[PDB]
Ligand binder design. Sequence first.
Ligand SMILES: [Mg+2]
Lengths: 199, 244, 233, 452, 266
Amino acid sequence: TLAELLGRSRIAQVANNHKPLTYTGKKFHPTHQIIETKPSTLYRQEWGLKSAIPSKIKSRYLVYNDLDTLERITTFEPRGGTQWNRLRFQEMGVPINPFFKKFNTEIIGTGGLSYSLPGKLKNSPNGVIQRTVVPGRILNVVKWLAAIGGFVADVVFFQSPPSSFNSMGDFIRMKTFLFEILEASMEKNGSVSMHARLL
Amino acid sequence: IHVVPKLPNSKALLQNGVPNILSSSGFKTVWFDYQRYLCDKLTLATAGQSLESYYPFHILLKTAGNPLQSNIFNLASSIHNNHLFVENILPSAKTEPSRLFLSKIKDSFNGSDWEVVKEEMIYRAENEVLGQGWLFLVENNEKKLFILTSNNNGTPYYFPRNQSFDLNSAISIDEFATLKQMKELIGKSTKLNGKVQDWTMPIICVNLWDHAYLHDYGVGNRSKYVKNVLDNLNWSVVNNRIFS
Amino acid sequence: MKIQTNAVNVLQRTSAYLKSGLLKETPAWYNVVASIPPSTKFTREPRFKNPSNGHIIGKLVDVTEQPHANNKGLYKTRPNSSDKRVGVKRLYRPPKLTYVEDRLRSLFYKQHPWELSRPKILVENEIGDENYDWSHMLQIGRPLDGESVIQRTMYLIKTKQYGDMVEAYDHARYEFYALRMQEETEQQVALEEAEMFGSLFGVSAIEHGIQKEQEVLDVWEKKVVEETELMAA
Amino acid sequence: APPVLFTVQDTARVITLNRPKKLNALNAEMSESMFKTLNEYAKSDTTNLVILKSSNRPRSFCAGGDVATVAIFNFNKEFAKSIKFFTDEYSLNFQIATYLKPIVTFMDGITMGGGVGLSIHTPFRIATENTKWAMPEMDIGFFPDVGSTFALPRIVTLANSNSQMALYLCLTGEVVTGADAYMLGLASHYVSSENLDALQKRLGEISPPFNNDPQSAYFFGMVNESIDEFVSPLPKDYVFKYSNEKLNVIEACFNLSKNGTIEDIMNNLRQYEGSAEGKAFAQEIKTKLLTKSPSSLQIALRLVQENSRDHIESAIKRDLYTAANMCMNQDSLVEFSEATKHKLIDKQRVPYPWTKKEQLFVSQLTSITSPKPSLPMSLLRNTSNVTWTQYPYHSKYQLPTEQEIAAYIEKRTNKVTEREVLNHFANVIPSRRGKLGIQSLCKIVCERKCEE
Amino acid sequence: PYPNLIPSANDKPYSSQELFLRQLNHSMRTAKLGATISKVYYPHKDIFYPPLPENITVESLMSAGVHLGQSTSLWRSSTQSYIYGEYKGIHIIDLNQTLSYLKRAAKVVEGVSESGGIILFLGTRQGQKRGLEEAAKKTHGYYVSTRWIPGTLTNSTEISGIWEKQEIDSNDNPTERALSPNETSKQVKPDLLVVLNPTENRNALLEAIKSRVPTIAIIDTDSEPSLVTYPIPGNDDSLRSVNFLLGVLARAGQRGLQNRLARNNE
Ligand SMILES: [Mg+2]
């Protein structure tokens, strides 16, 4: 019947949610399913939703709340950013087990951020990679805070900050540093707490 | 879904393989099972994504510059390569090299004969491909035919993914300087994806994977298999692959 | 808007024109419309069953059919005020379609918020072309996502291999983890093996993010300096 | 409640069979009420078409006639009541066949015996996924009774050039289900059950465009088109039940001259060398035909032989005479009531042991299909009172026959390709444009009846 | 094949144009090697390979998104009988009814094209031009996608009277006969109007009513059904759903035209 197909249809596969699309609080994890389109469908404003998305949207990713509203629009944001954070984490290689052997709503383990298992070495043309080096940005004078790969992490120094820190001041974020991501756990709220060290 | 293409004369291919190269159980291993295995894996790696709408050549060009999609690239490469190879060894869809092909051999390989270039290809495959890989005779934008050996699932179209050097073992300073120059040229591109133009196209492709020769030849004897391949190419296809 | 009369009776008015002689030639559509009549009722039609869950619409349970004490211990001996109100509106209200999977789709993405970051394509290929055996989770023509888990859960329930939805859902979850770990190891090892054979990549994800942050931060610096200078004056 | 319900849908009149427990088994009360009410509707100028359906919608449309009472009317020797029963039933069938207004039959569920009679004589007969069509009279010691011997030699599409597929269906009593009945031409349209409500509304709305004559071919075309609007594609993983090989088996083995006997068919079944599986299918038929009534087999054979070349009125009269004689059973030639007792009153799975095994002589079998002086009989007059050799509207609004496919292919001889025939029968003939299964039917016919 | 191209000399490399032709030769032969793609939706194919009306299923209407109706807050209750239910804050259109109405409308289009009547395809939303043009060109019909001038039917003399007209034979072959000014000045009224967005085209619907032209339209959850002769319940907001229904109607018209030419060639 039509009802069974509707229950199995791709729109039905997206779980209902009405969280604000313009949240200004703290973001620990994704809140909205990212919707993607191919170039061929985007050329025809086709996204598998009810209504054609406006031609102004050149990006191939969006998030949305309502297919249609009393305002005769679809409530959406042309953003798919949270996928690039996840992939960047996958590039770091630092791992984070409940993935091994009435309903509980709490996040299980990592909430899908990473499925990599703990103990493995990264072979390289030099040799086994002993530690993971990643570019980052020191944020503010404070363990300092660094923007690394879409995540805010805690920076610890070998001995003390260099002169560039206080030379630049609040413009310290303009320059790129190298960090060693020591470790990465996740807390109950669902937030990843990476510990790094400046180099 | 990506599906294995239907080959001309499939019944004869399943009954008697390719004469002078493969038995029936060898061609079944290299095409009717390996190509199915690869197409299933590509389908599982690209289903529900944009790449599902693209042919493997377009997939490997799109994913060539993205480090995290390498597995897809590998699949999309091998599939493509595996049909470039099979196509140019199939009995038919007595073919001989065209005048243009031999002319370009004389203008590229120091005025050498085709058999001499075949022996050079045997040697190149024997040495520079330890284990799995592909052997190619490719045409660059300079109208020059040269021999290219990729490891595993490197592609002949896009030089940053040729994978012509095995960095597991020691390399000569010449190879390291080549890698440094290619890295600098990659960095020279302005496109945000970091891609480069590369008009190299394959003329001849030989599958050096164990799925091709192991059953019919053995652990050694891959040189014999490559020789049988190059002595029994489908020259209609190979001649069509060269721009007139 | 008033139910219009003159769109569905074009044949009758045209035939009046033709019979009177006001119109000489019969139009090309005339015989076609005469042979294919329009629907001209435009009625509201009742419905007696919810299509999705099979709930019957428009049944009243009588007091005779409740012979047992309710949860508060009281028998039902006469109709209540709800039973005495005519519920004809429910027969015409388009029913709300409901599926247990939606409750189970909400749970998965509450337990795996980063599975929302995996892009999803809502453009259907062809719903009729799907021939899935949900005895396993991986399907040719499908991605691995929450819907695989939930369809496997529903399959396990309808075959009674599990009695409780919770246990079937947990089993599907663990199969999903088994497949995801394999996929991620495949990706990482593919990249490692590619680098070991001289694959020269350009910009990676981290460098991509760094360059976008730089593009934004240059404009931010300029605005900050301009605003500080303006504030000083 | 009354065994038949009559209702109105804005111009159509709906006749609902209303005996759910007995699966809408047809009676003389039911037949008489239907016959008289159809006689009334034939005169009404506010009636455009009649719909025939069942209240027990999914399980059954009409699960045969209620011949158990006919068998008790003969255990108590009340032969006049059996005569009245068959007179009513067959006069009703004759009325439906010759009705001048469209009749639409919803064969949603089991359709057997009297049900086929109610449904087979109308140009508009709709099968659904639930349609279970059969003609199981051979095992109760009875014959194809409802004009089936007249209809099946004419309407069946495949392997029916000499009524041999009709003979297979009649003698074996094979249950033909769903889209197989549509593809064989036993049903004229194929509509999902969920749609039959909407179709019923649509059939209640359409009227003749002007001059208000619902008896014209124009209105039959309109009804055909409105039914076509509710036909949905067959499921992708659907295959016709009888492969080309089994159709070859039927065509070879049930072919006969106009003097062929059941012994000829048995010899053909024994002496078949088609293929491995198609030779085992002939053995299956051999086996199950041996569980049938020897006398009923021959009676059905001669009835098909004569009614496949006769006109409708005399064919139905011949069925009436045969039923009367079989109930009389003067010479104990046929064990009808004795086996109807066996299988419709005790529900004994084991087949009734047919004591009377003989090859009835042609004259010993001609007197069981003829009028009689000691007991005159006649069908009841209806408003049409016409007769014909071929159906007026059936061929237009069902799938084409192999005969019509051959007529088109042989008109191009006196260079054709598959595409020509498929595109012709699919696109150009107006009443059959976009007809559901033209492509596959034409492929089957071309695959097993010509070479190029 | 490729005139006014000057090849290069064997000593010197390929030029940009030679590289283009070389990679075209590659693209048509070897670029598609490795695998064939199956069961994947390609947006252009709805326009160039629309199915026949008899082959349409509920599943293919649903994959096109025809079932997705307007928000329940914008419901026009006169469309109540077309609705299957509500799901995720929108009304779902009953696709069984959509299929029945679509087959009826397709048969009307086919019958009108088979009779040599004029068919007009009206759709004024953003990306509907391609489908409208192709429907018109395969039905030998006409289309508008820019704007419906009010009075195009009821004031045809003041609007369409100046544009040129043409005599054609049974095979639709231009006769190139000279028309009289009186003949050129006459109204040439469509025999069938099909509108893809009837809510934004009330002027056209009312003119068709006054000018007594039967009309087909895609009727969404907020649209008035009684304003058209042959409604098709469906989503009028998605270009995929609109193009699917339009391609179906265009193919039915094409089949009618082919039948007309067939009998006129016999
Ligand atoms: Mg709308």
